[PDB]
Amino acid sequence: HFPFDQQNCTMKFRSWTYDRTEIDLVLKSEVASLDDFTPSGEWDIVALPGRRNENPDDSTYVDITYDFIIRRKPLFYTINLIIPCVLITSLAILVFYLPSDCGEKMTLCISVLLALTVFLLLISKIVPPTSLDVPLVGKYLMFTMVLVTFSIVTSVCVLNVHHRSPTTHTMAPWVKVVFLEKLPALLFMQQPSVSEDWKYVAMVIDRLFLWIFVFVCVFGTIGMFLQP
Amino acid sequence: VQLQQSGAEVMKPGASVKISCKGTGYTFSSYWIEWVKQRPGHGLERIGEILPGSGSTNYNEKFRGKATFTADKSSKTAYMQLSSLTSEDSAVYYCARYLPYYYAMDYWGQGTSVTVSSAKTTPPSVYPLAPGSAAQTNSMVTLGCLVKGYFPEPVTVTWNSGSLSSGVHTFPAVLQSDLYTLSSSVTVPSSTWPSETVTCNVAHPASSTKVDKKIVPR
Amino acid sequence: VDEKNQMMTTNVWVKQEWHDYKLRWDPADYENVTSIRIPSELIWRPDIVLYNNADGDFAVTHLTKAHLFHDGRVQWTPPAIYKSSCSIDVTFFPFDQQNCTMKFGSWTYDKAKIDLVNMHSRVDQLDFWESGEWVIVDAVGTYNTRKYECCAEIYPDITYAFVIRRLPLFYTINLIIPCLLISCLTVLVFYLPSECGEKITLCISVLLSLTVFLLLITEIIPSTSLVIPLIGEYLLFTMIFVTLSIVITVFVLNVHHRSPRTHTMPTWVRRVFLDIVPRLLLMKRPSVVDTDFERSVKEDWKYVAMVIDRIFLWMFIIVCLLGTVGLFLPPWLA
Amino acid sequence: QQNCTMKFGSWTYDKAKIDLVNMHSRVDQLDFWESGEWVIVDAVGTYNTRKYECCAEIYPDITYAFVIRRLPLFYTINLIIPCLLISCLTVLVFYLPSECGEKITLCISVLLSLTVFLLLITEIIPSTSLVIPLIGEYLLFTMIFVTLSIVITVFVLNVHHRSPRTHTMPTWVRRVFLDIVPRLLLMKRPSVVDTDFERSVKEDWKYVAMVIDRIFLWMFIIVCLLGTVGLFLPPWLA
Amino acid sequence: DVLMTQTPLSLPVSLGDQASISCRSSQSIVHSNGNTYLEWYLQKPGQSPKLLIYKVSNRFSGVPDRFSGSGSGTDFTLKISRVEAEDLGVYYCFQGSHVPWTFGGGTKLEIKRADAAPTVSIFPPSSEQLTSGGASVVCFLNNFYPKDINVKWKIDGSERQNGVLNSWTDQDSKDSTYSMSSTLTLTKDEYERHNSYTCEATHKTSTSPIVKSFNRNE
Ligand SMILES: *[C@@H]1O[C@H](CO)[C@@H](O[C@@H]2O[C@H](CO)[C@@H](O[C@@H]3O[C@H](CO)[C@@H](O)[C@H](O)[C@@H]3O)[C@H](O)[C@H]2NC(C)=O)[C@H](O)[C@H]1NC(C)=O
Ligand SMILES: *[C@@H]1O[C@H](CO)[C@@H](O)[C@H](O)[C@H]1NC(C)=O
Ligand SMILES: *[C@@H]1O[C@H](CO)[C@@H](O)[C@H](O)[C@H]1NC(C)=O
Ligand SMILES: *[C@@H]1O[C@H](CO)[C@@H](O)[C@H](O)[C@H]1NC(C)=O
Ligand SMILES: CC(=O)OCC[N+](C)(C)C
Ligand SMILES: CC(=O)OCC[N+](C)(C)C
Ligand SMILES: [Ca+2]
């Protein structure tokens, strides 16, 4: 749940000379004293309970363990990591509204992928290199990079379709129906020579994926809202 | 362990009050102090919490801005300040000791009562009530001693030196227009009523008033 | 001064002076010997420690020789490297002024047994080694007494507050000016013609550079949530507006590349963006007639894209100018 | 899975003076603090005795072999999957049309990303020459083939932008790349008769570039699949 | 904010009869440590809440074993095996899992018994009420059970509903029966204008409303 995480860091106190038959560790109070505490500014103290632990199967083991339940203050990492990540992710769907004549689809999608990969690597450098769990922010970034790779492939296909002319390609009837009569009606396009017919087919293809990505990237808040 | 709260408070609308909760017998700085509001009607609402050791505080959205928490480590006391008092802020406020994910709210304060109104210390206006002239007399007859036009609470209505401990129904006080009013009823045999003497011993410690007036038969 | 870790490292001389009633002598009986240097581990010393230690030593560890005088006075001035904690406020970084404190006091002797006296109000700086990054505005020791739950007696302590001011030329040159140069290019994307095929390049480059600079700043300041540096806020708002500019540029490029064979221009769009808005922006389209209908409408779509660009060129300049002065002018004015 | 050892033994007393007994063969883990990055598969101490040229006597020792297995989720997510995502784009440059003016952008970006990731890996692994990581070999081969793709893309772009005013198409080029190869690649050019010689030949040059692209789209798909399977499949099988 | 809902709002159970309060969560309140932090509080009248159960099942030191809790996910229940007079009060839920921590609605526990008929009465205004310039007509509905009671005033055949004073008394102990003291206040000009004042009483024990009226003209 980083950067909205709560840590549980313990402090175990024993005598490394005398066992239970020689000394008995006892707690003066059931919590650690905060009578002269200096607040952190990055971490919040939630609870500092102390517990005296014995071993029923040892009889020579005693320890006093404190649990430091600390809660991170998330404003710093929110501002410096989560807002930039959301800003970059919001650019993942623009490639499907960019006209193919602009000649800049590849630039946009590749830049988005590069930024997401960089943010993923930075997050990796922040958190410990443990394999027990993945940060939800890391999972969301990874899902977005998979989507952006899919978008790069789709944009390559759309660009290939856009630059087709009667002198090089022939439009099969199944295309002339599916992508010029049926689908445009579904997506509320309403088409108003043949070289321009190929241009429209590309326009329909990337309009379809604009809808798909919006639903996937709006239901992608179900994987982000669950964090805070 | 013991949590001691300040006394009852009466304030005018738009003012601000500062309640205090003093904890003794434990590590005061290491336990959260939870503030709970209980309107006279019903319900327990949590205003928020403060950890005296640090300055950390939390507020429930309904009370954000209305309440502010502060703590004094030297004297083991925690304070809550209510701003822009109104009628709905009149309630009983509790302070409790809490350690999240661990020992729960095992110890509570006695509860501080706060009333918001512009009225003054009006004495009681007890109006003894007798049976109506056009009313049948039965074996069992219930008496009536009304008290109204008094402020602030409480008023201890009772009988002469506990003359009739049983069969007494002291109804809760209610605000008619701006002052509190109540009522009472005690069942007594018609045989002993002419002979036995009992009177409603109305009281008003806030006004230092002690007036008693019995009902005469019609 | 470690802003990231919130530690200050200082090289100080801990000047102490007290009286020992057993280390007294009459110099007349010892060839007029008035003072001697003795190891400080042979005698009693006060146990003055640094309360707010962080990553260092609590007590003095060098244990130099103590100067002992014939009347019982003992002067002990050992050196000490201290790494103390201090909260770092980076609201006005790199023009920030920090206030790092050092709390000194005896550890086991209460006020009734050992009492501390300020030798001098101000920390001595005669032998100070100027750093070139910070200047000590003020360094004063304040005597305090207070009670702890540990013990029933009062323990005195002297807290020194080192008010240090940063010299901002280095970070100015190395962070602030490059950030301003990169931000100056935020609004140029709205003057770039849509036929150049380089608007996306420009705005994306600006956004990525601003992100890199934000990460660089983050590598310096502490990870505290109490305050946000003004530079951090400015960079974040600039990134938000650059992302908005990228969205608007994508929309404008989509508008520019429309033709009758793919899109139909609503009559209201023609009305607004070819009569009203161009007039308000002091841009006058030449009165020209094109015989071809496809080329004519294709040219109208191009002009509508220009007008939309011009609308946001004005708005972003206004927002950029108002936002900048509305963020930095008040702090400058005290 | 790493196998890191720890050799223990008395320094100055030989076997006839101090002898070591294995308290327990297995290393104790009752108070082990789980790390979250590795797991101890096996930790067993082996008693050895051997002679050193220093001294005439036998010195016993107990050597502990810590067999530890890396938990791969962290490095999977942070290196492997990004490398695979970048590798998925290796052959896309051959399906981009030459009029888009962004083939170079794509292939160069792929090359630079793979190079950066190879450099990132090099900072983790030791600089030993005995073994080569499989990830390293895969990355190196991908960079080699992406460089080859950049070369082929430059050639194809040069071929696309030719015209009669600067280039003459040999008869054999026309024959091969307009009759034979397009048939074998299952791409059928529409039969269009353009009256203008200059505009017609420019279209022929544009089509010839498309054919050359499609040839290498098939080859690189085959090589990419065969190389990946021929590199990682055998290790995954035992 | 997790919403905690308690049902039933009221649970009448006779002495020695097992009681069961149910408690629902807007969302699962489970925690990673293997424990779900749910607590049950009892607040007798005029007292601060007392902790009964924490972590669903664990019983606070010093509570009778008859109390028992259980549940999981968003479903939790509190069971009282053999109720007793000291068990009377309001039981509250409390989730200590997700910040902020919220309370339950509350479940007022009462004891049921054989239904008792109401004892209706009406008293006309006293002389001092007339002197002060007002009217205090009070209707007493004592010793009626259950709470199925309604009051309606039909002045000379006209039903008046504006300015109605409603006041009810909590359950008693000696007899464990409710009581009602709804009244109405009228001005002298508005008091002498009308002639007939009536106070009906609708109760389950008698479906037909009980009539208790007096006429101003006498
Ligand atoms: C912080 O981490 C510590 C250490 O992992 C957690 O302590 C463990 O908490 C569990 C849950 O309460 C304990 O299990 C329970 O123990 C009680 C008492 O013996 C037993 O009656 C229950 O049946 C259950 O087994 C566990 O013993 C305890 N371990 C230690 C070493 O203290 C702690 O809960 C964590 N706290 C938070 C807020 O995450
Ligand atoms: C003793 O030494 C001091 C200097 O330390 C000097 O001022 C003084 O005159 C000396 N006295 C005698 C008697 O030599
Ligand atoms: C520095 O801090 C000390 C103690 O925290 C305080 O007394 C002093 O006023 C501060 N000075 C400035 C300039 O902030
Ligand atoms: C680990 O190394 C030791 C010593 O080289 C050897 O005896 C053992 O078989 C090895 N185990 C594995 C699993 O490689
Ligand atoms: C007696 C003793 O050792 O006290 C140490 C703590 N201090 C400095 C707050 C009193
Ligand atoms: C005798 C002596 O010091 O031997 C040291 C070397 N060793 C451990 C190989 C025997
Ligand atoms: Ca520094």
DSSP B41-77: SS--EEEEEE-SSS--EEE-GGGBTTEEEEEETTTTE
Pairing of strands B57-59, E4-7: unpaired
Residue E201's contacts (CB-CB under 8 Å, 6 or more residues apart) are E118, E120, E139, E141, E144, E149, E150, E151, E209, E210, E212
Pick from E59, E93, E96: nearest CA to E75: E93
Range list of H helices, chain C: 169-171, 177-184, 199-218, 230-256, 267-271, 277-280, 293-332
Place of tokens 């974040």: C236
CA dist A21 and C281 (Å) reads: 91
- Number of independent structural domains in chain B: 2
Range list of H helices, C38-148: none
Interface contact flag, C240 A42, Cβ < 8 Å: no
CA dist E139 and E141 (Å) reads: 7
| Per-residue CA distances from A173 to A73, A197, E31 (Å) | 61, 12, 59
CA dist B103 and C118 (Å) reads: 46
CA dist B12 and C251 (Å) reads: 59
Q: To which H or E segment does residue C167 belong?
A: none
User: Would you state the structure tokens that stand for residue D6, as one six-digit string?
Assistant: 């720890």
Rounded (5°) CA angle B150-B153-B157: 75
Residue A129 exposure: Cα atoms within 13 Å on the Cβ side: 12
Chains sharing 3 or more CB pairs under 8 A with chain E: B
Cis amide leading into B152 (omega within 30): yes
Verify whether ligand 1 is closer than 6 Å to residue A6 (CB atom): no
Range list of H helices, C81-136: none
Same domain, B27 and B134: no
- SS3 of residue E2 by DSSP: coil
CA dist C317 and D31 (Å) reads: 64
Domain of B16 in residue numbering reads as 1-118
Single-letter amino acid, residue A114: L
* Closest atom of ligand 1 to CA, residue E31: 39
Residue C215 exposure: Cα atoms within 13 Å on the Cβ side: 17
| CATH 3.10.20.30 is the classification of domain E115-214 | no
Cβ contact D201:D169 at 8 Å: yes
CA dist A173 and A171 (Å) reads: 6
Cβ contact A160:D95 at 8 Å: yes
CA dist E43 and E39 (Å) reads: 13
User: Would you state the structure tokens that stand for residue E141, as one six-digit string?
Assistant: 């509905």
The binding site of C for Ca(2+) comprises 1, 3
User: Would you state the structure tokens that stand for residue E188, as one six-digit string?
Assistant: 């002298």
CA dist E194 and A130 (Å) reads: 86
CA dist D113 and A116 (Å) reads: 13
Start-end ranges of CATH 2.60.40.10 in chain E?
1-113, 115-214
Ligand 2 pocket check: which of C32, C35, C36 to mutate, most ligand atoms within 8 Å of Cβ?
Answer: C32
Cβ contact C206:A115 at 8 Å: no
Q: What does chain C come to in residues?
A: 334
Find residue E180's DSSP bridge partners.
E141, E168
Residues of A in contact with D81 (CB under 8 A): 142, 145
Q: Cα dihedral angle (D114, D120, D124, D128), rounded to 10 degrees?
A: 60
Mutate which of D78, D79, D90, D208 to disrupt the A interface (most A C-beta within 10 Å)?
Answer: D78
Please, what sign has the CA dihedral across residues E190, E191, E192, E194? positive
Q: To which H or E segment does residue D108 belong?
A: helix D103-122
Q: What is the 3-state secondary structure (H, E, C) of chain D?
A: CEEEEEEECCCCCCCCCCCCCCCCCECCCCCCCCCCCEEEEEEEEEEEEEECCCCCCEEEEEEEEEEEEECCHHHHHHHHHHHHHHHHCCCHHHCCCHHHCCHHHHHHHHHHHHHHHHHHHHCCCCCCCCCCCHHHHHHHHHHHHHHHHHHHHHHHHHHHCCCCCCCCCCHHHHHHHHHHHHHHCCCCCCCCCCCCHHHHHHHHHHHHHHHHHHHHHHHHHHHHHHHHHHHHHHHHCC
Same domain, B22 and B54: yes
D190-194 long-range Cβ contacts below 8 angstroms, 24+ apart: D190/A166, D190/A167, D190/A168, D190/A169, D190/A170, D192/A166, D192/A167, D194/A167
User: Would you state the structure tokens that stand for residue B130, as one six-digit string?
Assistant: 């007798």
CA dist E60 and E54 (Å) reads: 7
Interface check A104 vs C, CB under 8 A? yes
Residues of E in contact with B45 (CB under 8 A): 103
Burial label for D237, CB within 10 Å (0-12, 13-18, 19+), is exposed
**D209 CA → ligand 4 middle, Å:** 57
CA dist C47 and C18 (Å) reads: 12
Radius of gyration (C-alpha) of chain E in whole angstroms: 23
Residue A18's contacts (CB-CB under 8 Å, 6 or more residues apart) are none
CA dist B18 and B68 (Å) reads: 9
Place of tokens 């082929």: D152
Edge-to-edge order in the sheet of strand C134-147: C48-50, C97-106, C154-166, C134-147
Burial label for B104, CB within 10 Å (0-12, 13-18, 19+), is buried
Burial label for A100, CB within 10 Å (0-12, 13-18, 19+), is buried
CA dist A107 and C203 (Å) reads: 11
Q: To which H or E segment does residue B3 belong?
A: strand B2-5
Single-letter amino acid, residue D27: V
Determine the residue of chain A that is closest to D103 in CA distance.
A106
DSSP state of E195: -
Same domain, B48 and B85: yes
Pick from E59, E189, E179: nearest CA to E119: E179
Pick from C56, C51, C59, C53: nearest CA to C14: C59
Q: How far is CA E176 from the centre of its chain?
A: 12
Cβ contact D66:D8 at 8 Å: no
**C6 CA → ligand 7 middle, Å:** 9
CA dist C221 and D54 (Å) reads: 57
Residue B137's contacts (CB-CB under 8 Å, 6 or more residues apart) are B131, B190
Q: Among B118, B133, B153, where does a domain finish?
A: B118
Single-letter amino acid, residue C45: R
Interface contact flag, A30 B103, Cβ < 8 Å: yes
Other C-beta atoms within 10 Å of B210: how many?
12
Residue E11's contacts (CB-CB under 8 Å, 6 or more residues apart) are E19, E20, E21, E107, E108, E109, E110
- SS3 of residue B169 by DSSP: strand
Choose among A74, A107, A122: nearest Cβ to C225.
A74
Burial label for C46, CB within 10 Å (0-12, 13-18, 19+), is middle
CA dist C218 and C214 (Å) reads: 6
Nearest protein CA to atom 14 of ligand 2, as residue: C32
CA dist D60 and D16 (Å) reads: 10
Pick from C112, C124, C113: nearest CA to C14: C124
User: Would you state the structure tokens that stand for residue C162, as one six-digit string?
Assistant: 């080192």
CA dist B39 and B114 (Å) reads: 10
Q: What is the fold, at CATH topology level, of the domain defined by C1-167?
A: Acetylcholine Binding Protein; Chain: A, (2.70.170)
Q: Phi/psi of residue C185, each to 5°?
A: -85, 5
Same domain, B50 and B88: yes
**D62 CA → ligand 4 middle, Å:** 14
* Closest atom of ligand 3 to CA, residue C159: 4
Terminal C-alpha separation, chain C: 25
Nearest protein CA to atom 1 of ligand 6, as residue: D12
Other C-beta atoms within 10 Å of E94: how many?
23
Edge-to-edge order in the sheet of strand E67-72: E4-7, E19-25, E75-80, E67-72
CA dist D49 and D9 (Å) reads: 10
CA dist B131 and B215 (Å) reads: 9
Pick from A228, A151, A164, A152: nearest CA to A202: A164
CA dist E65 and A190 (Å) reads: 74
CA dist B107 and B109 (Å) reads: 7
Other C-beta atoms within 10 Å of D87: how many?
20
Please, what sign has the CA dihedral across residues E190, B148, B163, E112? positive
What is the biggest distance separating any 2 CA atoms in chain C, rounded to whole angstroms? 126
Q: Phi/psi of residue A102, each to 5°?
A: -65, -25
Cβ contact B108:B91 at 8 Å: no
Pairing of strands E10-12, E107-110: parallel
Interface check A31 vs B, CB under 8 A? yes
User: Would you state the structure tokens that stand for residue E55, as one six-digit string?
Assistant: 């972590």
CA dist C77 and C13 (Å) reads: 6
CA dist A227 and A2 (Å) reads: 8
Pairing of strands E168-169, E178-180: antiparallel
Q: What does chain D come to in residues?
A: 238
Least Cα separation, residue D151 to chain A (angstroms): 19
Cis amide leading into A3 (omega within 30): yes
CA dist B104 and A186 (Å) reads: 59
Q: How far is CA A2 from the centre of its chain?
A: 11
Residue C20's contacts (CB-CB under 8 Å, 6 or more residues apart) are C43, C44, C68, C72, C74
What determination technique applies here?
A: cryo-EM
Single-letter amino acid, residue C140: V
Other C-beta atoms within 10 Å of B194: how many?
8
Residues of C in contact with A191 (CB under 8 A): 262
User: Would you state the structure tokens that stand for residue B172, as one six-digit string?
Assistant: 């809760």
Q: How far is CA C261 from the centre of its chain?
A: 56
Residue D190 exposure: Cα atoms within 13 Å on the Cβ side: 14
Interface contact flag, A101 C257, Cβ < 8 Å: yes
CA dist A194 and A202 (Å) reads: 13
Residue A21's contacts (CB-CB under 8 Å, 6 or more residues apart) are A59, A60
Interface contact flag, A146 D92, Cβ < 8 Å: no
User: Would you state the structure tokens that stand for residue A43, as one six-digit string?
Assistant: 């971490």
CA dist B13 and B10 (Å) reads: 10
Cis amide leading into C94 (omega within 30): yes
Pairing of strands E119-123, E135-144: antiparallel
Quote the strand ranges of D52-135, DSSP E.
Answer: 58-70
- SS3 of residue C76 by DSSP: strand
Find residue C212's DSSP bridge partners.
none
Give me the numbers of helices (H) and strands (E) for chain B, helices first please. Answer: 1, 17
| Per-residue CA distances from A169 to A176, B8, D103 (Å) | 13, 90, 20
CA dist C206 and C193 (Å) reads: 18
Interface contact flag, B27 A45, Cβ < 8 Å: no
Other C-beta atoms within 10 Å of A88: how many?
25
Single-letter amino acid, residue B184: S
Verify whether ligand 5 is closer than 6 Å to residue C107 (CB atom): yes
Start-end ranges of CATH 2.70.170.10 in chain C?
1-167
Choose among D82, D96, D207: nearest Cβ to A159.
D96
CATH number of E1-113: 2.60.40.10
Nearest protein CA to atom 3 of ligand 5, as residue: C108
Least Cα separation, residue A204 to chain D (angstroms): 18
CA dist B196 and A126 (Å) reads: 87
Pick from E69, E89, E90, E65: nearest CA to E78: E69
CA dist B83 and C174 (Å) reads: 48
Single-letter amino acid, residue A179: F
**What per-residue string of b and e applies to D148-174 under the rule 16 or more CB within 10 Å gives b?**
ebbebbeebeebbebeeeeeeeeeeee
Q: Phi/psi of residue D47, each to 5°?
A: -85, 125
Interface check A192 vs C, CB under 8 A? yes
| Per-residue CA distances from D66 to C194, D21, D50, D128 (Å) | 64, 19, 21, 21
Pairing of strands E75-80, E67-72: antiparallel
Q: Phi/psi of residue E21, each to 5°?
A: -100, 135
Least Cα separation, residue B16 to chain E (angstroms): 24
Cβ contact A170:D190 at 8 Å: yes
Cβ contact A137:A80 at 8 Å: no
Instruction: Tell me the residues of chain A between 141 and 160 that have a Cβ less than 8 Å away from chain D.
Output: 142, 145-146, 149, 152-153, 156-157, 159-160
- SS3 of residue C119 by DSSP: coil
CA dist D93 and D105 (Å) reads: 9
CA dist D158 and D149 (Å) reads: 14
Cβ contact A68:A6 at 8 Å: no
Radius of gyration (C-alpha) of chain D in whole angstroms: 31
CA dist B41 and E106 (Å) reads: 12
Nearest protein CA to atom 11 of ligand 1, as residue: E33
Sequential DSSP letters for A67-97: EEEEEE--HHHIIIIIHHHHHHHHGGGGGGT
The binding site of C comprises 1, 3
Q: To which H or E segment does residue E128 belong?
A: helix E127-132
* Chains C and E touch each other (3 or more Cβ pairs < 8 A): no
Q: How far is CA E85 from the centre of its chain?
A: 16
